[PDB]
Ligand binder design. Structure first.
Ligand SMILES: CC(C)=CC(=O)SCCNC(=O)CCNC(=O)[C@H](O)C(C)(C)COP(=O)(O)OP(=O)(O)OC[C@@H]1O[C@H](n2cnc3c(N)ncnc32)[C@@H](O)[C@@H]1OP(=O)(O)O
Ligand SMILES: CC(C)=CC(=O)SCCNC(=O)CCNC(=O)[C@H](O)C(C)(C)COP(=O)(O)OP(=O)(O)OC[C@@H]1O[C@H](n2cnc3c(N)ncnc32)[C@@H](O)[C@@H]1OP(=O)(O)O
Ligand SMILES: CC(C)=CC(=O)SCCNC(=O)CCNC(=O)[C@H](O)C(C)(C)COP(=O)(O)OP(=O)(O)OC[C@@H]1O[C@H](n2cnc3c(N)ncnc32)[C@@H](O)[C@@H]1OP(=O)(O)O
Ligand SMILES: O=CCCCC[C@@H]1SC[C@@H]2NC(=O)N[C@@H]21
Lengths: 199, 532, 532, 532
C-alpha cells in the first residue's frame, strides 16, 4: 500500500505534502488497524498499531509482536526485509490476485486476503453444466443418451489427456437435457460436456 | 544556482540547567494529561451504546473513517475537545460528531461523521457549531465534503440554541447548497436512520449512498413502520432519493471511494516548491524551552528553528521593533511568512508587521502567526495611546489579507493583541493552541483593579463610602472567573481554537494544514485606506 | 401602452361579524402592548444616568440621530427589543446601542450609536450581536456606516461571550476593514470618552470627527489625566488620529453631514420603476382579518391585497399547489415576487415555489416571503417522506438566489418550513415578525409526544416500566418551555428576526427596506444541482 | 491510492445458442455489404477520369491525403456515403469531396480535398453540405483546416440548391473568415485549376500553396489562355495571391507539412487522464449480441462493457428508471459519461437523465449517448401526457450542455426520443450509426394507422363513407415510404449521421473522436429554467 501511495505521489504536483506519507498518524492518539487474513480455512484477526517511529505493533490473539521492515528490489524480484520481535529475516514477496506469496529459505507460505462480498459478483452461481473436462483430451467413451435419467456418481464420459484416464461423473440426479460432445471429439479444458434439464 | 550556503537559526539548549528540567517536567505533565483525556474522549459515547450499535450490525464512526480514507494516510481530526464539560451533567464526547481532513482516492476531503452512540446522534448546539466550522473550512479551502449521516435530529431540549438563528442548523443546508453551486462536491452516505433534520442532508447532496437495511430516510420519523416510511429499497426504486444502494457499511465506503475517484479533479499549486528538509534540532526540546509558566519569556526564534525546513530563516527588519519577529522560511517545501511575538507590541512592531504583511500579500505567500502576547504587569500604560494609532494598521492589514493564514497560540493572547495577530475573529484558515496557552480580554488581576477603581470613583461621586473589605470582595470572584475561563480546555470546549496540539507535532500539523489549504487558488488582495 | 385594465385583488371584510370583532380586539391589544413597551425602551437607561449625561453637556443618542438625519426623513430603527429580559436582573434598554437606516445629505446610511446611559456604554454580548447584524446589513446593501462612538468597552463580566469567538467583538473591526476595502465609506464620530475597544473604531474609520472636550480617544483608559492621555486637541495636533475638530455635538453632526456630502456617490437603480399607487383597502382591517389565534386560517391574498400598489396581483400557477401563493406585484413602484403560505406544504407547492424562484432570479426581481407555516394537529405524518424529496428543492433554490430577499413572518414558523421560506439562516436582507407570530422547531405538544414515545420504547427495550404519571411529568415542562420560547419578544430579545412591526405599518416598512436594499447592484445567480 | 479493486461489467455470451448464431450471421452480412460498398465508393469517379487525372501529372486525392498526414497515423474519414443514390441517374462517389481528421506534423487537422474525377470537381448540393459540416466540426473543435482545392465551381444545373441560401456555398467563405478571425489556421493548397467559386478559397486562406503548372487561380475561367489568366508564376510574382510556389504535388504536400509545423500550437488537456486499458471482452461478439432485428431487445450494458477501458463501469441510479442506463467510465484514459437506452422512456428515466447530465456538466466530463428508442407496438399510449412533462426536461438539459457530446445510434431512433438523446439537431460533436439502425419520426405501421383514423373521422364528419379498401390503399404507400426512408444508407446519403461504422471499430472511432474533440477548452454551462 505504501508503494502504491508513492506511485500516486510521483504524478502529483504536490510531491512533498505530509498527506502523501504512510505514517497513519493521528492527533494525541495512536491509529490501530483491524486486518483480517486467511490461513488455510482459518481467519486470523490482526490488530496493527502504527507507531510514531515507523514500526508496527501487531497483536494476534494474546501475543504482541514488534514488526519493522522495508521493501527492496533485487533484479526483477521484490524482497521484504523485516524484523519480528528482534528476529531479522529476508523473503521474496509476491502479491497476486488475493494471495500473498512469501518465499524464504525456510519455506514458502501463502496467505489469502478476504474478498469483500460486494466485489464478489452477487448471485455468482446459478447452475452447473456437468463436470468440466479436467483437461484438453479426446473423448473415449460416452455413457449418456440425449435424454437419460442419471443419479449423482453416474459416469457420463471418459476422457484421455496426455495418456491419463479421467471419468466424468453425474453432479446431480437431474435427467440429461443434452450432450455437447460425441466419442472421438477433442474437448478443451473447462468446456461444458452435458446440459441438465432445469428443475 | 540555488546552492549558496545560508546560516541556520537555533541553538542547542542547556539540558543540565534546572530551568530546562522544570519546564520539561511541566510540559510533559500537560501533554500526558491531554493524551489521557483524548483517549477517554475517543472511547466514545458509552459501553452499552457501543454494544447496541455493534449489535445492529453497524460500524463505529472511527472505524468508518479508518476504512474510508486511503490506507496509512494521516488523518487530521478537528476540535476533539468540543463539548468537554460544556454542559453541567450531560457528557458529549467530541461534541457528538467527528470532523477531519483525510485523503480519499488521492484527494483531500473534509469528513463529517455523526456518532450515533452519543444521545442517539442528536444535535447539541456545540455539534451544530462544530459542523458549521468544518463546512466553512471546506468551503474556504475548496475541499469536497463527505457526510456519514447517522443522527436523530436536533436535541429537542435546548431547541432555541439549535434551530432559529443564522448560525443554527439551517446554515448547514445553506452551506451545502452554496458549496454545491460553487462546484465543491457534496457526498452523503446514509449509514443509519436519519430524521427530519437528517433527511434533508442526503436530498441536498449531489450523490447519495444508502445502506440496504440500516439506512432509513424519512422526512418525519414514525413517532407506519420505519422501513416502509423510509428505506433503502424504497428510496432507490420508487422515491428515487437514493443514488446508490449498499449492502452494508464496507460496501458503502467502497462505493464512496469510487464516487470520489470519478470526481475528475486535479490539484494544482500556485506557489513554488522546493525539496523538503527536516529541522536541525529535535522537536521535544520545545518542552524545556517553553515550559508551562507564562511569566517567563522565551525566544520565539527557537520555536521557529525547530519547525522550519533545515532551520533556515531569513529575518526581515531584525533590529527595528525587535519585540516582533518576521521573516521567510519553508515548511515541507511551501513558502511561508512567519510573524511571531517576542514581547510587548509597540508602534515600531506594528509598522514592521504591516510592512511584512503587505510584502507577503504582494508576493502571494502564506502567512503563519505565532501569538505570545504579554501581561501588563511589566508596564501599566506606557502611553498606550501611541499604540492605538499604529495597532490599527496591523489589524486592518491582517484583515484585508487574502493569502492563506494559519494562527498558532503558543502562549498568552490578551486584549487587542489577539486581534492584531490574526485572532479567531479574523478568519484564519486554521487556529491551534498549545496546552499551556491562556486567552482572555485581559489578565484577571488587571481586570479586577479596573472594576475596583470604577466603583470607588462612582461611590465617591455619589458620596457613598467604598469599604476596603468591599473592594477585596469584588476582586476575588473576578480573579477566579478569569483564571477558569482562560483554560485551553475551556476555549476548546467551545468551538473556538479548533483543537489543542502537542508541541512535538506542531511541524506535522502545520504541514498538513498548509497542504490542505493550498487546494484553493490564491486571489488578489485589496487593502483599505492606510491611515499613514 | 401600459393602459390595459387589470383585475384587482382583495375583498371587503364583514365588519359586523363577531369573528372580525374578536380578532380586531386581540390584535389591538397586542399592538398597544408593543407600543407601550417600545415607549418604555425609548425612555433610555435611567433618570439619573440621563441627568448626568445632560449635565456633561452631551446630547442624548436619539437627539443625536434626529439632528444627524435629513429634516423630516423617516428613520427605520432595527432591533428595538434587543436584550428585552435577556439577562436575569440587568436591564439593557435596546441592547445598549441604537441602529437604523436614515437619509443623510440625500444618501441612505446605516447609523450605529452607543447609548452611554446604559452601563456607561459597555458592550454586552447582545450589543455586539446587534452591531454585527447592522454591519452585515450595511455591507450587503453597500450602505455607508456612521458610528457615534460613546462606549466604555467590553463588559468586563461576561467577557467570554464578547471577546474570544469569531462573531465576537473583533468581527466589528474585521467588517470595518473589509467594507473600507470595498469602497463602502466608514465615518466615526467620537462623541464621548471611548476605551481600548472603542479607540480602535476611529482608527480604522476613513474619516474621524472628535469633540473638543467630551471626545477622548485612549487605547487604554487612566484606570495620567483623561484629557492628557487622550483628547481632541492632542489627537488633532500631535498624534494625528483625529481628522476633524468639533466644538460640541451639533458642530460634530454638521461636520458629519458635510463629510457625507463630499462622498461623491450617486444611487442608480437596475430594476424598472412605475408610478406608485396606494392599495385599494385600508391597512387597519388586517387586525380583524388576521387576529391573534394561530389555529384559525386566513387567506394570505387579503394581506397581499392590502400591501401592494393598487391591489394589483398577477398570480402564477394559481390552481397547482394552492397551499402556496406566488405572483408578481409592485410596492412603491418596485417590482417584487411574493411567495406566501396558505396551508401545509406539499410536493406540488415545493415545485411551484422552485419554479417561481427560478423565474424571479432569471428576471432579477426582488423576492418577498410571507411565512405562516401550519401545526401538525391536522395531519400527523401524511407520508412526509414525499415532502422531503421536494422540500429540499425549495431550500436549495432559495439559498442560491442572489436577488434581494425580504422575509416577513405573519404567523407560525416551524420545522423545515422555516428554512424553505427564507428563514433567518438563509440570509434575507431583512426579517420582520408581526406581534402574533410564533417560531420554534415544532409545536410543544408534538415535541412532548415525540419525547414520551422515545422514552417508552427505550424503557420497554430495557424492560423497565414507563409509568403514566412519569409520561405526564415529562410532557408538562416541555410544553411550558416551548410556549415560552416561541414568544415574539423572546425571539426579538435575541437579535433574531430584527424587530417587531405593527401590521398597519407593513407597507411602509417594506417600502423603506426595498429602497435601502436596491442600493447594491443585482448579481447573477448560480444554482447547484437540481435533484430533479 | 488508486489501487482499489473494482467489479467489471459484462458477461460471456452463449456462443452455442442459435439466437447468437443468427444475429452474428445477419450482422456479418450487413458489415460485408457495407465494406464492399465502401470499396466501390473508394474506387473513385471512374476509369477514364482517373486515367486523365493521372495523365495530367496530378495525384489522386486519396494519395494526396496519404502523403499529407504523418506516416502510419490513422485517418478518420467522415460521410463516406454522402450522395449514395441521392440523385436519380448521376453517380457522386463520396459526394465529390473527401473530408476527415488526421495528424499533420503532430497536430490534428481537418482535411477537405476535392475529387476532380467526379464531374470535374463541380459542387453538388450534397458536396456543399458535406464541406459545411466539416467546417463546422473544425470550428467547434478548434482544428486547423487544410483545403486541397481542385474544383470546377458550382454545378451549373441545380444552381438554386447551391448558391442562394444561408447554408449554401457562401457559408463556406463565411466560416473561413470567422475561423480565421478566431485564430484557427486556414491553409489552402491549390493543387489544380479552380474557378470563380474555387478562386475565393485561396484568397481567404491565411497561407496559400499553388503548384507551378497544374495550379491556376482565376476569378473567372477562360470560357485568354488559362495559364496567362491564372497561373502559379503570375500569382506568385505579380498578383501576389500565392504565398508559396510548389513544383508538383509532393512538393506542395511537403510545404504544407512545414507550414503546419510553423503554426506554434500546443495541445493542452483540461480533463484528467489515466493509463489506458483494453476491454475485457472481444468486440466481435457485438455482432451476435445485437444482431439485425430491432424487435428483439439486448442489454446495453454488454455494449458498454465491450467498449470501455477495462470493462469498468460505475452505474448511477441503477434501480430508478431502469429503462435508462447512466454511469461513469473511461475510454483511452479520458473520462466519459455514458447515457444509454434500455427500453421505453418514462418520467423516472427522464428525471434520472436530467440529473446525470447536470452532474456531468458540473464536473466538465464529456458525454456519450447510445440511442436505441423502442417502437410503440408494446404500448399504444401509456398516458404519454405524463412523459411530455418530463421529456422536455431532458431535452432542455441536453441542449444547454456545453461539454463535448458524441451520439451513437445502435438501434431505432424515433419520435421525441431522438431529440431527448442528443439527436442531430442538438449539435453533438460527432454522430455515428451502426449498419442496422433505423431512424424516422415514427414506425410506418403506427403512422399509417394515424393517417387512416384522421381520414375516417373527417369523412364521417363530412358524412362521406371511408371504404375499407380505401383505408388499405392509403396505408400501403405510407408503410413502404417509411421503410425506405429509414434505411441507414438513406440517412447517410444525406449528410445526416456523418458515416456508418462497423461495430467492431466503435471503440477506436470513439477514441479518435474524443481525442479530436478535446482540443477545444471546455466552457461553463448555463441552464435555462428547469420546469421542475
Ligand atoms: C431539523 C429540524 C428542523 C427538526 C428536527 O430535526 S425534529 C427531530 C426530532 N427527533 C426525532 O424524531 C428522533 C427520535 N429518535 C429516535 O427515533 C431514535 O431514538 C433514534 C433515531 C435517535 C435512534 O436511537 P435509538 O432509538 O436506537 O436509541 P436511544 O437509546 O433511544 O437513543 C438515545 C435516546 O434518545 C433520546 N433523545 C433525546 N433527545 C433526542 C432527540 N432530539 N432526538 C432523538 N432522540 C433524542 C435520548 O435522551 C435517549 O437516550 P438517554 O438519553 O435516555 O440515555
Ligand atoms: C476591546 C478590548 C479588546 C478590550 C476592552 O475593551 S477592555 C475595556 C475596559 N473598560 C474600561 O476601561 C472602561 C472603564 N469605565 C470608565 O472609565 C467610565 O466609567 C466610562 C468610560 C464607562 C464612563 O462612565 P462614567 O464613569 O461616566 O459613569 P459610571 O456610572 O461609572 O458608568 C457605569 C459604571 O461602569 C460600570 N461598568 C461595568 N462594566 C463596565 C465595563 N466593561 N466598562 C466600563 N464600565 C463598566 C457599571 O457597572 C457602573 O455603573 P453601575 O452598574 O454601578 O450603576
Ligand atoms: C462560386 C460562384 C459564386 C460561382 C461559380 O462557381 S460559377 C462556376 C462555373 N464553372 C466553370 O466555369 C467551370 C468550367 N469547367 C472547366 O473549365 C473544366 O472542365 C474543369 C475546370 C471543370 C476541369 O475539367 P476538365 O475540363 O479537365 O474535364 P471535363 O471532363 O470537361 O470535366 C467534367 C465536365 O464538366 C461538366 N460540368 C458540369 N457541370 C459543371 C460545372 N458546374 N463546372 C464545370 N464543369 C461542369 C461535366 O458534365 C463534364 O463531364 P461529363 O459530365 O460530360 O462526363
Ligand atoms: O503410446 C505411447 C507410449 C506409452 C503407451 C504405449 C503402450 S505401453 C503397452 C503397449 N506396448 C507397447 O510397446 N506400446 C503400448
Amino acid at each position: 500500500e505504501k508503494a502504491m501511495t508513492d506511485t500516486f505521489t510521483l504524478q502529483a504536483h504536490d510531491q512533498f505534502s505530509p498527506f502523501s506519507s504512510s505514517s497513519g498518524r493521528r492527533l494525541n492518539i495512536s491509529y490501530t488497524r483491524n486486518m483480517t487474513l486467511k490461513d488455510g480455512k482459518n481467519n486470523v484477526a490482526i490488530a496493527v498499531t502504527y507507531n510514531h517511529d515507523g514500526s508496527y505493533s501487531m497483536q494476534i490473539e494474546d501475543k504482541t509482536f514488534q514488526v519493522l521492515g522495508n521493501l527492496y528490489s533485487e533484479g526483477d524480484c521484490t524482497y521484504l526485509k523485516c524484523s519480528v520481535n528482534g528476529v531479522a529475516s529476508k523473503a521474496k514477496l509476491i502479491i497476486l490476485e488475493n494471495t500473498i506469496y512469501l518465499f524464504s529459505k525456510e519455506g514458502s507460505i501463502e496467505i489469502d486476503i478476504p474478498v469483500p462480498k460486494y466485489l464478489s459478483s452477487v448471485s455468482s452461481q446459478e447452475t452447473q453444466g456437468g463436470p468440466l473436462a479436467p483437461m484438453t483430451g479426446t473423448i473415449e467413451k460416452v455413457f449418456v443418451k440425449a435424454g437419460d435419467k442419471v443419479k449423482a456418481g453416474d459416469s457420463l464420459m471418459v476422457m484421455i489427456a496426455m495418456k491419463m484416464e479421467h471419468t466424468i461423473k453425474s453432479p446431480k440426479d437431474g435427467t440429461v437435457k443434452k450432450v455437447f460432445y460425441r466419442e472421438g471429439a477433442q474437448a478443451n479444458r473447462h468446456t461444458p460436456l452435458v446440459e441438465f434439464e432445469e428443475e | 544556482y540555488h546552492g549558496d550556503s545560508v546560516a541556520s537559526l537555533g541553538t542547542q539548549p542547556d539540558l543540565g540547567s534546572a530551568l530546562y528540567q522544570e519546564n520539561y517536567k511541566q510540559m510533559k505533565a500537560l501533554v500526558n494529561q491531554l493524551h489521557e483525556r483524548v483517549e477517554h474522549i475517543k472511547l466514545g459515547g458509552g459501553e452499552k451504546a457501543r454494544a447496541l450499535h455493534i449489535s445492529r450490525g453497524k460500524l463505529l464512526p472511527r472505524e468508518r473513517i479508518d476504512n474510508l480514507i486511503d490506507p496509512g494516510s494521516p488523518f487530521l481530526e478537528l476540535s476533539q475537545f468540543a463539548g468537554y464539560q460544556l454542559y453541567d451533567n450531560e457528557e458529549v464526547p467530541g461534541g457528538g460528531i467527528i470532523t477531519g481532513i483525510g485523503r480519499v482516492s488521492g484527494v483531500e476531503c473534509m469528513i463529517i461523521a455523526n456518532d450515533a452512540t452519543v444521545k442517539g446522534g442528536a444535535y447539541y448546539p456545540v455539534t451544530v457549531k462544530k459542523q458549521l466550522r468544518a463546512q466553512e473550512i471546506a468551503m474556504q479551502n475548496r475541499l469536497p465534503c463527505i457526510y456519514l449521516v447517522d443522527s436523530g435530529g436536533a436535541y429537542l431540549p435546548r431547541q432555541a440554541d439549535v434551530f432559529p438563528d443564522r448560525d443554527h442548523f439551517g446554515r448547514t443546508f445553506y452551506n451545502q447548497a452554496i458549496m454545491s453551486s460553487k462546484n465543491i462536491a457534496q457526498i452523503a452516505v446514509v449509514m443509519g436512520s436519519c430524521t427530519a433534520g437528517g433527511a434533508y442532508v442526503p436530498a441536498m447532496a449531489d450523490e447519495n449512498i444508502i445502506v440496504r437495511k440500516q439506512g432509513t430516510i424519512f422526512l418525519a420519523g414514525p413517532p407506519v413502520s420505519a422501513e416502509d416510511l423510509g428505506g433503502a429499497d424504497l428510496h432507490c426504486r420508487k422515491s428515487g432519493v437514493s443514488d446508490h444502494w449498499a449492502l452494508d457499511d464496507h460496501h458503502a465506503l467502497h462505493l464512496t471511494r469510487k464516487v470520489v475517484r470519478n470526481l475528475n479533479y486535479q490539484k494544482k499549486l500556485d506557489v513554488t516548491i522546493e525539496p523538503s528538509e527536516e529541522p536541525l534540532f529535535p522537536a521535544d526540546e520545545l518542552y524545556g524551552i517553553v515550559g508551562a509558566n507564562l511569566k517567563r519569556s522565551f525566544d520565539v526564534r527557537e520555536v521557529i528553528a525547530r519547525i522550519v525546513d533545515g532551520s533556515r530563516f531569513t529575518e526581515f527588519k531584525a533590529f527595528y521593533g525587535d519585540t516582533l519577529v518576521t521573516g521567510f522560511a519553508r515548511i515541507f517545501g511551501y513558502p511561508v511568512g512567519i510573524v511571531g511575538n517576542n514581547g510587548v507590541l509597540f508602534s515600531e512592531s506594528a509598522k514592521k508587521g504591516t510592512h511584512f504583511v503587505q510584502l507577503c500579500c504582494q508576493r502571494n505567500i502564506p502567512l503563519l502567526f505565532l501569538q505570545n502576547i504579554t501581561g501588563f504587569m511589566v508596564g501599566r500604560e506606557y502611553e498606550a495611546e501611541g499604540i492605538a494609532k499604529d495597532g490599527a494598521k496591523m489589524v486592518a492589514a491582517v484583515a484585508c489579507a487574502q493569502v492563506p493564514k494559519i494562527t498558532l497560540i503558543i502562549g498568552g493572547s490578551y486584549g487587542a493583541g489577539n486581534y492584531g495577530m490574526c485572532g479567531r475573529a479574523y478568519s484564519p484558515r486554521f487556529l491551534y493552541i498549545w496546552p499551556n496557552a491562556r486567552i482572555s480580554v485581559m489578565g484577571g488581576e488587571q481586570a479586577a483593579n479596573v472594576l475596583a477603581t470604577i466603583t470607588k470613583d462612582q461611590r465617591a461621586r455619589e458620596g457613598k463610602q467604598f469599604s476596603s473589605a468591599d473592594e477585596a470582595a469584588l476582586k476575588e470572584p473576578i480573579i477566579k472567573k478569569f483564571e477558569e475561563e482562560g483554560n485551553p480546555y475551556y476555549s476548546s470546549a467551545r468551538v473556538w481554537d479548533d483543537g489543542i496540539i502537542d508541541p512535538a507535532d506542531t511541524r506535522l500539523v502545520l504541514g498538513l494544514s498548509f497542504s490542505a489549504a493550498l487546494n484553493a487558488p490564491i486571489e488578489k488582495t485589496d487593502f483599505g485606506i492606510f491611515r499613514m
